[PDB]
Amino acid sequence: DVYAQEKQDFVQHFSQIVRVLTEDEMGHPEIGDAIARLKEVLEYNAIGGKYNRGLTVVVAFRELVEPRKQDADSLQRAWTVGWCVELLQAFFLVADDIMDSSLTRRGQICWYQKPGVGLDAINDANLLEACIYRLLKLYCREQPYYLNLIELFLQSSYQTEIGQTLDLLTAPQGNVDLVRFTEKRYKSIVKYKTAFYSFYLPIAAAMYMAGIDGEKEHANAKKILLEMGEFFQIQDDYLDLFGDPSVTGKIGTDIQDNKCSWLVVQCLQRATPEQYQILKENYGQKEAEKVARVKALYEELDLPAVFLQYEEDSYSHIMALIEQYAAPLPPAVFLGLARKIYK
Amino acid sequence: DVYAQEKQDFVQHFSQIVRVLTEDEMGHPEIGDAIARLKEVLEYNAIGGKYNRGLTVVVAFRELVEPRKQDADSLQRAWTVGWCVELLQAFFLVADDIMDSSLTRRGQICWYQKPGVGLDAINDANLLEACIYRLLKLYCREQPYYLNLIELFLQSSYQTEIGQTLDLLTAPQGNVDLVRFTEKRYKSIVKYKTAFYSFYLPIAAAMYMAGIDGEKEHANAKKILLEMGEFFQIQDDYLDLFGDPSVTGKIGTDIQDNKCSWLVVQCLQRATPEQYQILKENYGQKEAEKVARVKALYEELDLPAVFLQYEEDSYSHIMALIEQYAAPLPPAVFLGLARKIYK
Ligand SMILES: O=C(O)Cc1csc2ccc(Cl)cc12
Ligand SMILES: O=C(O)Cc1csc2ccc(Cl)cc12
């Protein structure tokens, strides 16, 4: 509930973010047509998500900063940096939906799939990335942590980018080579491609804004956060198949998309000669008959029970981790975030 | 000749740049496969050009910095930042060749056109962009101008990105709307898409490294450089058609690519009802017969003579500009660069 009480002032600040960004054409009417395009890009790709990453920046801010140092301006910056995280998010989404040729995202049609856009979406994505640094300059230009944020964001893009390469190398479009879907590879892909920018970035950003720039502190927070990120992804894979669209709010397709899901990774470590063959002969197909056939092989391997088990162990681990590395940070920082992920 | 005497130590430093970038997997063997991909990306897209933008950083450095302050380390940084400019260049090229669906570049096949790559080139381009900031950190992390360079590069991407949008809005793929190919639009497209990162960036970078961070000085250098950039583009358009492949080293295709060239912009400001119709009925076609037909309409309008004229006026203007805003910078900085562009 710590988030719901913040989501309003957050999603509402979005309107200002836009105004600010699309108001440099005021002094340069020449590039006006481009700025109008930028606004359309932002209003379509940065809106429509759950804003968890963005909100985490704000929620963490209030918890790390003293109630009196949270003046109108300090909250204004936290919202802006919260939206920069969402912009980084938007940047990756637009680009990723093009590479894997997705059809929809957040319920609507993918930006590049929109008539008239197409590959020009590549430039749009690059722009969303740029606005990040334009905002950090417009608001935190003079703050003592200005350079900290810039580097954090830049590094988060590099991490995510590297993770993206890894994933493209692992499950090529048209290569059901289940031989590379190993254990370590799955954890490396999740670490760089998701864990870092989804969990470390948001909190690390709120830290630097609170003055907590200690390499040790960030090192500790990262250890907890990356572990959370890893669980989140595994619970994402599980729910993708054995989940319930009514609750999840989306139907799974990892099996059909030949994804290096956590499920298939466990299926491969627990498969007999003939079983592997069955998978190697159904993982990827679009036919629901061949897909459900795979789900059956998973259930038969009691993977869902394996998850339930791993989940219990994970919960303990994270708690053990929070009790060891949270300090000098308020355990609530991690506890709140964790409770929003687990169960 | 000021460049040729530097191009060697420059293109040779490229080998070290790579080593440095692709050596972080030493402490993280996990993302090794990705780092190997990064190396292939860099060796294919950052090499094979004339390195003018990159060299300009180095050549300008030696001219702005006192001969004694040019120790082994100072030259090491100048080469690195010179290559960052080339990496920014590579980043844009890869992305642009995909958006306009080009077939070749620098003689070879476009990276995305390479079998196995395709749209994954979108991530590759994003990586080339990342290496820029990874290098600035590995070498100028401790320099007093560190933040200056980071912002300069970030801003140069935003400018280039905005210019790119403008160009995509002006000459859409499948819209021979010669109505938007105006005068001001052409200058706005060139200013953001080329002039800024091609001419201002290289010198501005060498300035910040020399301690020249004055907002006024940079403002002056920018005024000269953006004007040079504009001429360069106009001479680029002219030579694209009325040039000579033997000297230019490339055959023009602006007419066929429905490009908002400088030629067509002048052709439209100097066209009678029927003449405009002729153009409006040949500009874009692939048929050499319909293309040469356009060249004829240009020559008939004495545009080549109009260029010769504008060129003489331009040369004077730049000289008048250098004599007014060069100081306190060594006129040779701009003079050398200009002589490499003109005639
Ligand atoms: O929303 C996502 O896709 C992943 C994520 C990152 S921080 C955070 C906080 C709460 C919840 Cl529910 C999810 C997340
Ligand atoms: O090389 C290019 O394409 C444009 C350019 C930027 S700085 C510079 C210096 C010398 C020459 Cl010949 C060209 C250029």
Side-chain angles (χ1 to χ4, degrees), chain A residues 3 50-53 56 89 198-199 202 232 337 340-341:
Chain A
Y3 277 50
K50 294 178 289 284
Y51 314 106
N52 299 308
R53 306 185 174 66
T56 296
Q89 169 70 324
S198 293
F199 302 88
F232 169 81
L337 177 59
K340 219 188 166 73
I341 298 178

Side-chain angles (χ1 to χ4, degrees), chain B residues 9-69:
Chain B
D9 284 305
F10 187 71
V11 182
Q12 199 147 174
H13 181 61
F14 178 64
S15 187
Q16 150 142 66
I17 292 290
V18 182
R19 180 197 314 122
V20 175
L21 285 175
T22 56
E23 211 177 299
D24 80 307
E25 112 275 45
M26 297 279 256
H28 295 288
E30 37 176 347
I31 47 96
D33 277 7
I35 294 293
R37 167 65 177 228
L38 178 46
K39 186 180 177 181
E40 195 176 322
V41 172
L42 288 158
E43 296 187 311
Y44 187 106
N45 298 288
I47 288 289
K50 294 178 289 284
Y51 314 106
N52 299 308
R53 306 185 174 66
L55 284 179
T56 296
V57 171
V58 168
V59 167
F61 176 62
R62 298 178 165 301
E63 297 179 17
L64 294 179
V65 159
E66 303 175 55
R68 83 279 185 58
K69 287 191 177 185

